[PDB]
Design a protein around this ligand. Structure first.
Ligand SMILES: CCCCCCCCCCCCCCCCCC(=O)OC[C@H](COP(=O)([O-])OC[C@H](O)COP(=O)([O-])OC[C@H](COC(=O)CCCCCCCCCCCCCCCCC)OC(=O)CCCCCCCCCCCCCCCCC)OC(=O)CCCCCCCCCCCCCCCCC
Ligand SMILES: CCCCCCCCCCCCCCCCCC(=O)OC[C@H](COP(=O)([O-])OCC[N+](C)(C)C)OC(=O)CCCCCCCCCCCCCCCCC
Ligand SMILES: CCCCCCCCCCCCCCCCCC(=O)OC[C@H](COP(=O)([O-])OCC[N+](C)(C)C)OC(=O)CCCCCCCCCCCCCCCCC
Ligand SMILES: CCCCCCCCCCCCCCCCCC(=O)OC[C@H](COP(=O)([O-])OCC[N+](C)(C)C)OC(=O)CCCCCCCCCCCCCCCCC
Ligand SMILES: CCCCCCCCCCCCCCCCCC(=O)OC[C@H](COP(=O)(O)OCCN)OC(=O)CCCCCCCCCCCCCCCCC
Ligand SMILES: CCCCCCCCCCCCCCCCCC(=O)OC[C@H](COP(=O)(O)OCCN)OC(=O)CCCCCCCCCCCCCCCCC
Lengths: 558, 177, 459, 171, 100, 128, 87
């Protein structure tokens, strides 16, 4: 026992020690990014021991170590919940962050605020492991708002640029609309259950839990970019590449999904919450994957990829399979962080070129980047026995064989095909064909930082699904009996997506010029949703914030 | 429309700008290079069909429905260059573009860290302040009554003088600090 | 309380007998010593308030407002000493004397055992504040605010005076300790309805209430920095303190007289926060933010649950510190660019990185980032108003979107983007200014460690 | 430590180490390394500190409040006695709050300690929690922010009138 | 023309005549000692010793006592078979209800 | 033929598809030349103060000062209470207050009626 | 990464583009060859040359400057202005 809780707290204190180092500085640093990367490597090594001794016995515990407040019946203590979710998320998050920082020591080398960048990225990591280890709603709200604010500060990293500040304020807006529902859930549990602690919520086990679960679904909508509150995740590609790699693909954006996986004993006894999660997840995984088909910025395409995977996570929560959703989080982190890292390696090699229509011929120019991008795309689509096979296919193997919304299943399959479509679209326009980038080739990737940082997540994207899924215990019963047209569903739909998009890509070499269709104009302008509501809802606010609020009432009449 | 020197766009400028925007939006439509180059010569032929049109009212109408053609056939997200406005790297380093006068607010312990730089900056500022009144009295006798008509400035006429309104154009920050 | 009133009065011979170059240093030193002395008021008990004499007492409501009041004087002396450098020495000592006299009035306003001594000190605090605002306000254009001060005197403090004299004749006393045990229920009658309005409307204007907030984005604008600091930090909170004392006598009629004014605040924080999205004046934006935060304190006092009083006094302390720091940041740019226009000086993180760090921290406390006591007060008020009505969470949460929206906008406009070209007098940050920001922020951050001392008498 | 009756812990049942595979686990080696490198120096420093605790043994005490007369037997508007009654009532209010907090700590620790069988094996703690929350709600809910012993007595009297009327209407 | 008026005084810079100015005063010795007073009696005195004072407050509003007292009373009434809390705060025998 | 672009409040018509941009008349030459003249004169008046070394401060912009004085000061003294101002100050002034008043009063009367009839699940509700 | 541009490099690259253009002969092309008057090109050809410069160097020349660049030396001078060469 004395090993588990000790190294659990040592991981978090070790992550906080470079924040004290960067705040207690007088000299100019002897490579402070290397210091933070070494610290997070050792924090990974430290958190490996509680994970291994959890896989040995199933040892979960709670560390309610510091009494903080007592509001008359509510003892808010500093309480860390070490369960299956923390024991599988903390090594994956530390491993991904360690690869992102060895990536950033190459990519962000020209930035004179590199110490501020690594400081902010460590602050994000601290707030995120506050989020995923919290035992009450208040400490989880601390980590929740912390990853929201570090999202603000890392989107608006180039703070002189107007679009970065605009996207950062946009992300804060949609996350606070999710925070309306999170505070609704906290309010409901405090009034009806007298607690913010998870244990008393789970032990009391309320039955009229539609309203707190609607609050939690609105919170996951604001946080995991579900439909209605989605466009900030494509807008948030205006930040740097390791920001979009770590935060907005693999670590922050799974926290609404993690919030709903965390409250699984309430969702497993509320069919209405499961149905709403299933419908919203299927809507998001349709819409964002459809928008990804007709984009040309590679960071936008991989952001729509990760939001479609978040919608699929919401789907597999909505079929009452939360542990498969969390296995898909731990799986998805590796190859999606690696896809953003390889895309940004292309971007930095091609002198800040992000548009895929000026790329190509990079199969033999950037060989390691091409190899890892193909491996990440095939792990995304569901190639057999890569890491993305060990969760996502099982998701389909439980989405077919369950009492399910049928249209949600059909849109889930259309999303599964669209994943293959935009993956081979990225490989077509960025790796295949003949070059389209300008004439002064500065293409290079031979830094051990970049190569080792993509290499360790490559080892993850090859072996981690097998290793984790053979190291996690059963928490449901895997539905393993189905007809052969139903077992071969996800693979056949994925290969049909590959065939359809290869025919689409080979219609582009033809010497014909067609007028744009309405489907192309719809999917290219993002379902017309960021074009209308980003103009209309500010307008109807701000005129109402000036004409009647300031001028008419609160300067003349009142 | 809105320009610093001219108050309008000439018809020749309108034709060239519409040709350029048509080719750029076409290259956005027509990703591959040989395919775009084929359609680019086809579109060059379409623009050179009515290059020799003498009637400016008929050329005005042809330009107007050419704008309608370009608007009907435009790409929704055309290729913007990264440091072009609307690009992904546009105005990215503007947070690093510190104005030069902030060097005047440094402490002398860090001004002494770069002695040759500030020792030369003193005579740069000396040059500016003995150029200023000469270029003001240059501009006050050349500007017509009612103020200047166009925003363009005259150059340095005498030998030894400097061109007027020059300090912020010369001492502007680098585009990659 | 007489170990605090007498040093505050000895700051008058300290400020008038000091040498001409020493009058800021001496008053700052001895007011910091009084603020260190002010922690002896933390001898509170779970059953009994700390009752010093027949004239003065201190429960856990008055104690943090006293500590904040005695802490606010050195910060005002730091903030107001730059723009009084070319002032006459005697006028400078008159300024310091009016600040000391305002602290003297406040620290025996919050400890007033009896309610008409509370009224005398409560309406005594307006006069040095009035003289500070109108003698050192750098411009005075108050054509509409005179009629509003007449409306404050008519609808506010005078019915409170007549009502307190009526309670003095009826109950026989206005000791709050006696009124804890001799309180009669105030039933439904028209006499008791005008009684409720007389007991409440003075403190409604002092909070301020929405619709009655017309004075506050004028009096904050036309004031010096010390006046705006003491208005945002303490002088709004006299209304909340007086409501939490006077709602003892107003039961149970409050349970149906609160319903209009609660609406006036629950919609009102939706409006004024939205008003902050269209402010050209930064100081007016911070003023409307103060209205948008004191609306929650009005609701939390009127719904009179324990969680609402805990959240309301935590929000009062937290918003005092936060909005005082916001006005000090607004002045730290106004002393350079000489205009309050928020779109004038932009991109200031390129020029002042540590000051932009202070802007970031004050914005994050302004938008209630947990675990700060802004969020603790905000959150407990939201929980209690959910217990009041489950729909109000919408009007809470929507406010908690817009409260974020103008908080970062104030950060994005002033500190981010491209710097303004034609402004070249942007000096580096003086150590005085950074010390002022830290003496605001570091107590506000340390109170997140131990918030139980700012949660009122029924923690 | 503490009192094992107010904080009950059922007798722990750990299974024996049963090594089936020939590969040596890392956890025994890391446990021995933690026992040598970490447990021993911390334990030696704690023994030094405890010797220094023994070199000056001095004590503190739990304050006792003898029961003064309550609000029922205090005269109306007699502040000298009903002040004592109010102080007694407020001390009992805060102590009842901490009793509720103790029962909540029991319920949460039972749920975690039983793990997945928490619904089957924590019926008694949930029953005690339901009884103590019903008692605390009948005793102190809906008083308001200006609560007192008079408000609590009037709520008790209204509840007793309701219980007497419910007893009367049943016969 | 308009009256005899002194012109607008320009805003002085405290860094020109004193590049080590902290902004407290224009006299440098007065400025540095104002800085030392603000930093010592603000940070070294009020914040540090104040947090040390607040951290070791002797059971602020008797919370800890009230837990330990509860740890007595539960132990008194778990053992004697009593319920943990009565539904009546006062004794229902010493209460006279209005009859009807 | 082609779909004509529809302008909107939040979707303005382009400069290219507006017909009055293609005016060639001499009065449009006069208007464009006077706009270029005013813009050039204001540009010169700006950057003589901007490029001045003897000035170290803020080039004050009286259009900006005039904008802030219009957004703050000119609101009351150019008010006239008429039908339009009174009806619009009664719609958005006492409208949503009455709306949320009746909504919250209705829900609280419903909740009070359910509590005094023993209906509302107030089981574990001891924080309030 | 991001190699420094020189007037020799900008000159040689602009002339390297114009020597791969089938309306400009590589023997009459100089550094001061005017497009309309000396090389005999159209304004359409001049717009294609400035767009080829945009394709070459990876940024955009605006139209108010693209309508006036009438020699390769003006192109080299404009890229020298927009890239800050010979530090
Ligand atoms: C009683 C003893 C207690 C001891 C422990 C201390 C407890 C807290 C004390 C105060 C903590 C903050 C102090 C620093 C901030 C203010 C100054 C500043 O900006 O310095 C920048 C500077 C470093 O920057 P730089 O590059 O040198 O120059 C500035 C740059 O130009 C430009 O700057 P920049 O943009 O590059 O970087 C600014 C960056 C910007 O970063 C951010 O804005 C990110 C912050 C938000 C997201 C992350 C946090 C989310 C919440 C989770 C963490 C809290 C809970 C954790 C607990 C477990 C989970 C529940 O800010 C930071 O890095 C600050 C780190 C700490 C942030 C705390 C949260 C602030 C957010 C708003 C309130 C949130 C809720 C309340 C939190 C209360 C915590 C107790 O720091 C220093 O030089 C340090 C000065 C000395 C600090 C002393 C601190 C103690 C003071 C108290 C004295 C009395 C007690 C004695 C203790 C003495 C200990 C030594
Ligand atoms: C390098 C730094 C380390 C220090 C090196 C030098 C010292 C060597 C190491 C030994 C240290 C001394 C012995 C151990 C410490 C003392 C232990 C002890 O009993 O301390 C008393 C107590 C323990 O609590 P407690 O339960 O005894 O009492 C609480 C107080 N009452 C009852 C009044 C409410 O305090 C601490 O331990 C303080 C440290 C806490 C650590 C975490 C701080 C986080 C702060 C976050 C602020 C916001 C919170 C928001 C979230 C809240 C929850 C949702
Ligand atoms: C704020 C807006 C209302 C202010 C009203 C004026 C101050 C009233 C202070 C309370 C006085 C009081 O005891 O009222 C009950 C007393 C009741 O009279 P009484 O208390 O003498 O009667 C004996 C007791 N009963 C009622 C049982 C018979 O009210 C009044 O006498 C009149 C109250 C209204 C005052 C009208 C003039 C001012 C109008 C508003 C101006 C602003
Ligand atoms: C108060 C009303 C007026 C308001 C304005 C006041 C202005 C004047 C200021 C006067 C002085 C200050 C007064 C308030 C002081 C409040 C602080 C205080 O006393 O705290 C007591 C608290 C008391 O904690 P406690 O409640 O556990 O105390 C237990 C009681 N004793 C000590 C007796 C056993 O002190 C601490 O918590 C200190 C613990 C050790 C130091 C902290 C360790 C962890 C810190 C964080 C580490 C990094 C985390 C990750 C960060 C990531 C990046 C963000
Ligand atoms: C996983 C198993 C992959 C192999 C089995 C499926 C084979 C298949 O049907 O491939 C379809 C298609 C090849 O056929 P086609 O492209 O039309 O013809 C040209 C041939 N080079 O296209 C391909 O083979 C390319 C897509 C393969 C997808 C692999 C990942 C799933
Ligand atoms: C303007 C500035 C910005 C806004 C700030 C606030 C200004 C207004 C302050 C007062 C707000 C409205 C008055 C308070 C409403 C409380 C409930 C109420 O009075 O309901 C209306 C009443 C219903 O009748 P009822 O309450 O039963 O009357 C018998 C009482 N024993 O209906 C009636 O009895 C009919 C109407 C009778 C006239 C009442 C006049 C006195 C109240 C206003 C003063």
């Amino acid at each position: 026992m004395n090993l588990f809780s000790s190294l659990t707290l040592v991981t978090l204190i070790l992550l906080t020690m470079p924040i004290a180092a960067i705040n207690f500085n007088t000299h100019k640093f002897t490579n402070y990014p290397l210091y933070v990367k070494t610290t997070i490597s050792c924090a990974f090594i430290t958190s490996m021991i509680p994970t291994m001794m959890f896989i040995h016995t199933g040892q979960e515990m709670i560390i309610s170590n510091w009494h903080w407040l007592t509001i008359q019946t509510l003892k808010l203590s500093l309480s860390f919940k070490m369960d299956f979710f923390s024991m599988m998320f903390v090594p994956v998050a530390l491993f991904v962050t360690w690869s992102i920082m060895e990536f950033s020591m190459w990519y962000m080398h020209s930035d004179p605020n590199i110490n501020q960048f690594f400081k902010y990225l460590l602050l994000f990591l601290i707030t995120m492991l506050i989020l995923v280890t919290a035992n009450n709603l208040f400490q989880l709200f601390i980590g929740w708002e912390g990853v929201g604010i570090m999202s603000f500060l890392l989107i608006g990293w180039w703070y002189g640029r107007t679009d970065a500040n605009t996207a950062a304020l946009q992300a804060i807006l949609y996350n606070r609309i999710g925070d309306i529902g999170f505070i609704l859930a906290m309010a409901w549990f405090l009034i009806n259950l007298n607690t913010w602690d998870l244990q008393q919520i789970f032990m009391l086990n309320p039955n009229d839990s539609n309203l707190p679960l609607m609050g939690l679904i609105l919170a996951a909508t604001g946080k995991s970019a579900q439909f209605g509150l989605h466009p900030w995740l494509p807008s948030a590609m205006e930040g740097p590449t390791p920001v979009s790699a770590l935060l907005h693909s693999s670590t922050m954006v799974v926290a609404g999904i993690f919030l709903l996986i965390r409250f699984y004993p309430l969702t497993e006894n509320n069919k209405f919450g499961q149905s709403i999660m299933l419908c919203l997840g299927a809507m998001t995984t349709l819409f964002t994957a459809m928008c990804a088909l007709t984009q040309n910025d590679i960071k936008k395409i991989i952001a729509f990829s990760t939001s479609s995977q978040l919608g699929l996570m919401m789907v597999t929560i909505g079929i009452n399979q939360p542990h498969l959703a969390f296995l898909h989080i731990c799986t998805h982190a590796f190859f999606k962080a690696m896809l953003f890292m390889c895309s940004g390696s292309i971007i930095h090699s091609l002198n800040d070129e992000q548009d895929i229509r000026k790329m190509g011929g990079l199969f033999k120019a950037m060989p390691f980047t091409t190899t890892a991008l193909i491996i990440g795309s095939l792990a995304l689509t569901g190639m057999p026995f890569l890491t993305g096979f060990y969760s996502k296919d099982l998701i389909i193997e439980s989405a077919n064989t369950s009492y399910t919304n049928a249209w949600a299943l059909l849109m889930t399959l259309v999303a599964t095909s669209f994943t293959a479509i935009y993956s081979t679209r990225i490989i077509f326009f960025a790796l295949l064909g003949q070059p389209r980038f300008p004439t002064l080739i500065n293409i290079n990737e031979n830094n051990p930082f970049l190569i080792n940082s993509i290499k360790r997540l490559l080892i993850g994207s090859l072996f981690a699904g097998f290793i984790i899924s053979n190291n996690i215990p059963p928490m449901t019963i895997p539905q393993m009996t189905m007809p052969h047209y139903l077992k071969m569903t996800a693979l056949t739909v994925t290969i049909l997506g590959f065939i359809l998009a290869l025919e689409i890509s080979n219609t582009t070499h033809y010497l014909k010029f067609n007028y744009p269709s309405n489907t192309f104009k719809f999917s290219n302008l993002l379902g017309y949703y960021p074009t209308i509501m980003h103009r209309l809802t500010p307008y109807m606010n701000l005129t109402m914030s000036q004409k009647s609020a300031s001028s008419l009432l609160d300067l003349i009449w009142l | 429309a809105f320009l610093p020197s001219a108050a309008y766009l000439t018809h020749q400028q309108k034709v060239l700008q519409l040709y350029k925007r048509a080719l750029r939006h076409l290259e956005s439509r027509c990703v591959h290079r040989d395919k775009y180059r084929y359609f680019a010569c086809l579109l060059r032929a379409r623009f050179d069909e009515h290059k020799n049109e003498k009637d400016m009212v008929k050329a005005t109408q042809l330009l107007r429905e050419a704008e309608k053609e370009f608007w009907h056939g435009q790409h929704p997200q055309p290729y913007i260059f990264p440091e072009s406005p609307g690009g992904t790297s546009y105005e990215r380093y503007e947070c690093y573009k510190v104005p030069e006068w902030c060097l005047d607010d440094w402490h002398p312990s860090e001004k002494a860290m770069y002695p040759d730089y500030f020792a030369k900056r003193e005579q740069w500022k000396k040059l500016r302040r003995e150029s200023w009144e000469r270029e003001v009295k240059q501009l006050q006798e050349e500007t017509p009554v009612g103020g200047p008509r166009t925003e363009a400035l005259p150059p340095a006429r005498k030998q030894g003088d400097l061109p007027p309104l020059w300090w912020h154009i010369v001492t502007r920050p680098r585009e990659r600090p | 309380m007489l170990k605090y009133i007498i040093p505050t009065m000895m700051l008058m011979p300290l400020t008038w007998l000091s040498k001409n170059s020493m009058i800021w240093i001496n008053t700052t030193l001895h007011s910091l010593l009084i603020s260190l002395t002010s922690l002896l008021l933390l001898n509170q008990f779970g059953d009994n308030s700390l009752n010093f004499s027949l004239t003065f007492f201190s429960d856990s409501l008055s104690t943090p407002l006293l500590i904040l009041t005695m802490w606010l004087l050195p910060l005002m002396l730091m903030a107001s000493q730059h723009h009084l450098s070319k002032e006459n020495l005697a006028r400078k000592k008159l300024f310091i004397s009016m600040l000391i006299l305002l602290q003297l009035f406040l620290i025996m306003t919050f400890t007033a055992t009896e309610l008409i001594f509370f009224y005398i000190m409560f309406e005594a605090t307006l006069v040095p504040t009035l003289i500070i605002i109108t003698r050192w306000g750098n411009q005075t254009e108050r054509l509409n605010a005179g009629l509003y001060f007449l409306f404050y005197t008519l609808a506010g403090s005078l019915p409170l005076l007549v009502a307190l004299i009526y309670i003095q004749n009826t109950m026989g006393s206005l000791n709050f300790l006696i009124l804890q045990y001799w309180v009669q229920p105030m039933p439904n009658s028209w006499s008791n309805t005008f009684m409720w309005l007389a007991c409440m409307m003075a403190f409604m204007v002092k909070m301020p209430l929405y619709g009655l907030h017309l004075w506050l984005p004028k009096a904050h604008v036309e004031a010096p920095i010390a006046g705006s600091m003491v208005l945002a930090a303490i002088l709004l909170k006299l209304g909340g303190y007086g409501m939490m004392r006077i709602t003892l006598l107003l039961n149970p009629i409050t349970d149906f007289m609160a319903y209009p004014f609660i609406m006036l605040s629950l919609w009102g924080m939706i409006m004024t926060s939205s008003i902050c999205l269209r402010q050209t004046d930064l100081k007016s934006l911070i003023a409307y933010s103060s209205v948008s935060h004191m609306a929650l304190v009005i609701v939390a006092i009127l719904i009179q649950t324990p969680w609402s009083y805990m959240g309301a006094t935590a929000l009062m302390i937290a918003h005092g510190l936060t909005s005082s720091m916001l006005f000090c940041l607004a002045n730290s740019n106004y002393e350079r660019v000489h205009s309050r226009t928020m779109i004038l000086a932009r991109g200031l993180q390129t020029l002042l990185p540590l000051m932009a760090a202070w802007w970031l921290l004050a914005s994050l406390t302004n938008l209630a980032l947990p675990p700060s006591i802004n969020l603790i007060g905000e959150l407990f008020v939201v929980m209690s108003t959910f217990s009041w009505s489950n729909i109000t969470i919408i009007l809470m949460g929507l406010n908690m979107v817009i409260t974020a929206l103008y908080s970062l906008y104030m950060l994005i406009t002033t500190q981010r983007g491209k710097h303004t070209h034609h402004i070249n007098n942007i000096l580096p940050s003086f150590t005085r200014e950074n010390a002022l920001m830290s003496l605001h922020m570091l107590p506000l951050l340390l109170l997140s460690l131990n918030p139980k001392i700012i949660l009122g008498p029924l923690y | 430590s503490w009192d094992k009756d107010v904080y009950p812990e059922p007798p722990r049942r750990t299974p024996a180490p049963s090594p089936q595979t020939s590969l040596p686990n890392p956890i025994t080696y890391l446990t021995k390394a933690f026992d040598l490198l970490v447990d021993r120096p911390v334990t030696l420093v704690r023994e030094f500190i405890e010797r220094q605790h023994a070199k000056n043994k001095y004590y503190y005490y739990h304050r006792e409040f003898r029961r003064v007369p309550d609000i029922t037997e205090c005269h109306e508007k007699d502040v000298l006695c009903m002040f004592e009654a109010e102080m007694q009532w407020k001390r009992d209010y805060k102590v009842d709050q901490e009793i509720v907090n103790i029962i909540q700590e029991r319920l949460k620790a039972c749920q975690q300690r039983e793990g997945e069988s928490h619904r089957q094996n924590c019926a008694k703690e949930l029953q005690q929690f339901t009884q103590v929350v019903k008692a605390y709600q009948d005793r102190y809910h809906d008083l308001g922010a200006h609560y007192s012993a008079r408000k609590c007595l009037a709520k008790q009297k209204q509840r007793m009138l309701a219980e007497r009327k419910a007893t009367k209407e049943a016969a | 023309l308009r009256w005899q008026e002194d012109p607008e005084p320009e805003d002085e810079n405290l860094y020109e005549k004193n590049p080590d100015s902290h902004g407290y005063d224009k006299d440098p010795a007065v400025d540095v000692w104002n800085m030392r007073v603000v930093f010592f009696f603000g940070f070294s005195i009020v914040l540090v010793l104040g947090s040390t004072f607040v951290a070791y407050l002797p059971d602020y509003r008797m919370q800890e006592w009230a837990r330990r007292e509860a740890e007595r009373l539960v132990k008194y009434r778990e053992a004697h078979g009593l319920p943990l809390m009565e539904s009546n705060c006062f004794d229902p025998s010493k209460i006279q209800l209005p009859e009807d | 033929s082609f779909p004509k672009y529809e302008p909107s409040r939040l979707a303005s018509l382009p400069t290219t598809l507006d017909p009055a941009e293609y005016d060639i008349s001499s009065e449009t030459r006069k208007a464009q030349a006077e706009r270029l003249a005013i813009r050039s004169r204001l540009k010169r008046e700006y950057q003589l103060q901007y490029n001045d070394p003897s000035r170290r401060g803020v080039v004050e912009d009286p259009a900006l000062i005039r904008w802030t004085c219009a957004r703050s000061a000119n609101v009351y003294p150019n008010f006239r209470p008429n039908t339009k101002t009174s009806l619009l100050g009664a719609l958005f002034g006492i409208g949503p207050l009455i709306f949320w008043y009746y909504v919250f009063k209705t829900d609280r009367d419903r909740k009070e009626k359910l509590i005094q009839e023993g209906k509302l699940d107030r089981t574990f509700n001891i924080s309030y | 990464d991001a190699p420094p541009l020189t007037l020799e490099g900008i000159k040689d690259r602009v002339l390297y583009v114009l020597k791969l253009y089938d309306k400009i002969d590589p023997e009459k092309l100089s550094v001061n060859s005017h497009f309309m008057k000396d090389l005999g090109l159209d304004s359409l050809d001049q717009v294609e040359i400035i767009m080829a410069m945009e394709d070459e160097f990876g940024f955009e020349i605006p139209d108010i400057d693209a309508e006036k660049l009438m020699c390769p030396q003006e192109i080299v001078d404009y890229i020298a202005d927009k890239k800050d060469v010979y530090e």
